[PDB]
Amino acid sequence: GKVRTKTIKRAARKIVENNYESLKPKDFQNNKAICSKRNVAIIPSKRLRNKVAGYVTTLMNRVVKGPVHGISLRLQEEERERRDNYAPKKSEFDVENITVSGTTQQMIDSIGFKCMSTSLK
Amino acid sequence: NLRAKLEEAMPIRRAAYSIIRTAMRAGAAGCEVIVAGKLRAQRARANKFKEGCLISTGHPKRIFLAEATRHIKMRQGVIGVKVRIYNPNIRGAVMPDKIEIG
Amino acid sequence: VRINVLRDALKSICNAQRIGKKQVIVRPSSKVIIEFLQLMQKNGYISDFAVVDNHRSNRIVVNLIGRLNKAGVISPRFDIPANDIEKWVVNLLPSRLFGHIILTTSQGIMDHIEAQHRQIGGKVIGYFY
Amino acid sequence: PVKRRNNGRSKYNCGHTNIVRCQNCHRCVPKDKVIKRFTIRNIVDNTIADDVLNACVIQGFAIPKLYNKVQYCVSCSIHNHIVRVRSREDRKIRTPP
Amino acid sequence: DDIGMKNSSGVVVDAYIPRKCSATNRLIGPKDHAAVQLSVARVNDKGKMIENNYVTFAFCGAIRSRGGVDSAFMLLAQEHGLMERL
Amino acid sequence: EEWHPSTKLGRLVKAGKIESLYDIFKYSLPIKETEIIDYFFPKSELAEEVCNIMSVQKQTTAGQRTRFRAHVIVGNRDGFIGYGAGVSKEVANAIKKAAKNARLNIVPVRRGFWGGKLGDPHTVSSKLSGKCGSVRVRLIPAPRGAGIVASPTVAKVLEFAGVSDVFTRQSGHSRTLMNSVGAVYNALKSSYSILTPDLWKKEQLDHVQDIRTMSL
Amino acid sequence: QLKEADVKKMLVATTHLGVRNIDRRMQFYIFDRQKDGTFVFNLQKVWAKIVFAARILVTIDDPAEIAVVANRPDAQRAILKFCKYTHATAFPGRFIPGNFTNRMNPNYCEPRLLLVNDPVVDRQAILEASYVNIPTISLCNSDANLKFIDVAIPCNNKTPMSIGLIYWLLAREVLRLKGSISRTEEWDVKPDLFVAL
Amino acid sequence: MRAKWAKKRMRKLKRKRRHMKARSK
RNA sequence: GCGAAGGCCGGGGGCUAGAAGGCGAUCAGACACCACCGUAUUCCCGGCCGUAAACGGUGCCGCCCCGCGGCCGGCGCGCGCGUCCCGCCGGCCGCCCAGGGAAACCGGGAGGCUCCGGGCUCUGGGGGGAGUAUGGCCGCAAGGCUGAAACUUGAAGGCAUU
């Protein structure tokens, strides 16, 4: 019966995308302590602060337990970058695998180059 | 200033528009002017001219607003002017919902 | 069936210009269409027109230069006093300076300007601008 | 305002169609306009079907299916919710919902 | 010569002269927002490199709504030698 | 305060890279800054009049709200006209919205000679026509001796165009003002898109004169 | 000037294949129909279109002005690689309407050219182009709508192999015109970088 | 159907006038 | 000349429904809706009658006009080869870019139109009065067809928005 407001959700999400390392996954109190630092963020009231902290401990569990959408974390961004940059070591893609459509051979003949002397079938 | 400006019979919209400017320049993010009565007519109406965003409810409203009520007198009858000025930067603290997150 | 042939062809020429097609095929051909096309070619609103002669009525293939705004037929082919040809131009054609009303005269099919030049009245075949 | 291109009916290249009767209202409707739903539902309920199959003393018995084409008039069908009023844009949309 | 309205003197008095596009030839309007000018470079001799001698083909928004530009571009390319007629 | 360009065209205009307003109309570019119109027209802006405000109402549970729509014609006296309309609860703000919108939609007008050419285009170059809603107005080229012959609203925008003589004929709900002025606006934007024989010379291919090409 | 290596790669890439539905505008490009119904493209015509697109793409003084838009998940890697290997400004995923027309929009680019993976999928950008005089180049299939597209490339655009190789092939030619590739030697960048796993 | 019922009512008045004329004749 | 239904004149028939009528109920009153019963009618033949929201509410003969499919009736192009493909189609249709419109919407037109003219025939001119009055014609009738005026009056109406 407790649904958070946009302000609570928005503040908490900046807290996680920035100070993810300071936050801990299951404990609200450690996350509340990070909120209490004040240098990281200004939180007016005790209840407002607890709500931002409470969402942030759920967010912390969720970001460790799989990716969470809309969470801009630099360390996770590097992890995809090595995965995206790496291509097969031998660059095995087409690998001269040939294989044509029966109509394609006639189209290749239409150009007149006739790749592989019509041995493409 | 408005009530006495209204007496010289200046345009009622112009009066509010000039007062609205001097509050925003002085810093108020929220400025609200409502003049209500038999203005240029034999019938009642209320004319709200407002520049900016003003909180209207709650504990911040009590300390962050400047509602002032005055009753102009006119041959037609009383055309009371109400001006409410909201300052988030009240220096007494912060807005309860204003999360700086800097 | 087709009572006016020029109008049906000219409408096709305008319709092709709307969809930006240079070449049009006109299914019915006539000497009046022939002459109307020749006058437009002279004023350069249309390009070369080639008639594929057939053992029947004939078809014309016309290359368009994309420079005709509108063509038309006047039905019936009214009688115009040579003096009042200006009134026909003032209303049908835009601007006294630009646009051609195409007439027919005993001397021959002629331009409104040429008709004024010798002051001979006639019957209006149609109009092109 | 022409509400529908169909004009409520699927008569095309026609002038007259067979009359049918709303199955509840018993009213005469043009065949094209009528709802014309079809049901192949079996005779006995799914629960009774297990009890009856165990009871049956003939091997290879299967519950008989019952086939009927329910035709209802517009007023009859919309009231019993066979079809529903649709949004201006959703009226154009067809297909079984 | 000098596209525009030459006065009785012959001075052009047609302020900005609108652009007739390279296929349809209709004048680009003052507010014809969908007019598009696309330029194709010329490979300079041998080298597969530019020469800064790109030729520019304009395309009015009427033939673009039709979608006629891709075909018209191709034909005009061979007309200006940016492709072979094939 | 002063103007800071938010649009690439505005930055070129601020620099002075674009010499004339017509240069942006050659490339038919959108004007998204009224400030750009001031750059080409800085003394007293353009002649703009507010031609009748009609009160407009939306029924609501409490009652009919009232919003004002104003029609403003901005124009000079030579081949430049703009028409726009603006909606605001305050009549004054709506008049401002219309005048700004009119500045955002300035359009060039052709102008030409009825039959005799001297030194000045005195009339519309063609029988320009346009239609907004039911209304349709045709602007017919008129002799230099004749005056501009149109009803007071259409005459007003024809003066801002600077068409010294016209023989306009209007058909439709001309009584509806917004629609009438809009037809006389679409007729003038048609002037610079009607192909005529004098414009049959073939060329273009400017490349470096392109407005997109220019850089700050 | 077709090259044998890319064509053999295209044969594995299936760029020579298109949807059974077919359009008259792309009829010239298509060669035939498989008896399965699938439509088979002319590879040389694709290459001629690819080289033509390169000449158009380079003219823009800043290669940052060409904008690559893809909402197809498969094409995302291709257009981001192309934007990184070349200099295009990427507008991936949801295009966000008014990106090209709203000045107060978080991103308000004024591109001199546009690049589209799918005419139907990336439709918002092609309409946005019309409002602000921007020509467009698209990766069309055998059935596509060429509305508002200045030049179109015949390709699968639904095959990840085909999408990636086409973007790689396009990238090779655009920087070849700028002298940053080899010409007669293989580009060091490989086509498998453009393709997602 | 008011128009259908209105036509029926004119018919009755038309008969009454047509018959009344015969009695007068 | 033909023309749904209802009707009509006169036979044949007569199951079913069922204008009339009668009866339950229902209501304040229903003599209405809902039961139940039931005459004319419904069916056939020989005549009438001549109307329908007889509607695509869109006359007919043309000419051109863009895509995307479906269906039906022929005919070809091929192809391993299948009621497959591809055309030509004659119609029946859906969707639609331009284009058109007051818009809804049409787009196989309601497009090619103030940039207004292929040809032909019909019809309308604010609303009532009035499809009445009167004369004619037609019908056995019911009626149909043609068709006013005095007088009265500021809206009636279309399509859309909240």
Short mmCIF file of C-alpha atoms (C1' of nucleotides) in Angstrom, two decimals, chain G residues 17-27 30-34 36-41 119-120 140-145 154-158, chain I residues 67-70 85-87:
data_model
loop_
_atom_site.label_atom_id
_atom_site.label_comp_id
_atom_site.label_asym_id
_atom_site.label_seq_id
_atom_site.Cartn_x
_atom_site.Cartn_y
_atom_site.Cartn_z
CA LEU G 17 17.51 -11.72 -50.76
CA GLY G 18 14.31 -9.66 -50.19
CA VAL G 19 10.72 -10.12 -48.91
CA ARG G 20 8.19 -11.88 -51.20
CA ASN G 21 6.08 -8.69 -51.30
CA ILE G 22 7.57 -6.43 -54.07
CA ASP G 23 7.27 -2.73 -55.14
CA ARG G 24 7.41 -1.21 -58.67
CA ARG G 25 9.94 1.45 -57.57
CA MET G 26 12.41 -1.35 -56.57
CA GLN G 27 11.45 -3.59 -59.54
CA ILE G 30 15.20 -6.89 -58.28
CA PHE G 31 16.30 -9.65 -60.70
CA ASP G 32 13.73 -12.42 -60.08
CA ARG G 33 11.50 -14.40 -57.68
CA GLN G 34 12.50 -17.74 -56.04
CA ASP G 36 9.55 -20.28 -52.67
CA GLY G 37 8.29 -16.71 -53.40
CA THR G 38 11.34 -14.88 -51.97
CA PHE G 39 12.61 -12.04 -54.21
CA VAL G 40 16.34 -12.08 -55.23
CA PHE G 41 18.19 -8.74 -55.70
CA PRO G 119 11.53 2.92 -44.22
CA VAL G 120 8.51 1.69 -42.17
CA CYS G 140 15.09 -0.26 -48.53
CA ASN G 141 13.81 -3.86 -49.04
CA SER G 142 12.02 -5.27 -52.17
CA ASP G 143 8.70 -3.98 -50.78
CA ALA G 144 9.26 -0.52 -49.26
CA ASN G 145 7.66 2.92 -49.48
CA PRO G 154 18.20 -2.56 -52.11
CA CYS G 155 19.05 -4.97 -49.19
CA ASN G 156 17.46 -7.37 -46.64
CA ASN G 157 17.56 -4.71 -43.81
CA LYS G 158 16.00 -7.52 -41.67
"C1'" G I 67 -0.03 2.03 -54.59
"C1'" C I 68 -1.53 -2.19 -51.71
"C1'" G I 69 -4.16 -6.68 -51.59
"C1'" G I 70 -8.81 -10.02 -51.93
"C1'" C I 85 3.48 -18.25 -60.91
"C1'" C I 86 2.93 -14.15 -64.14
"C1'" G I 87 0.25 -11.08 -67.11
#
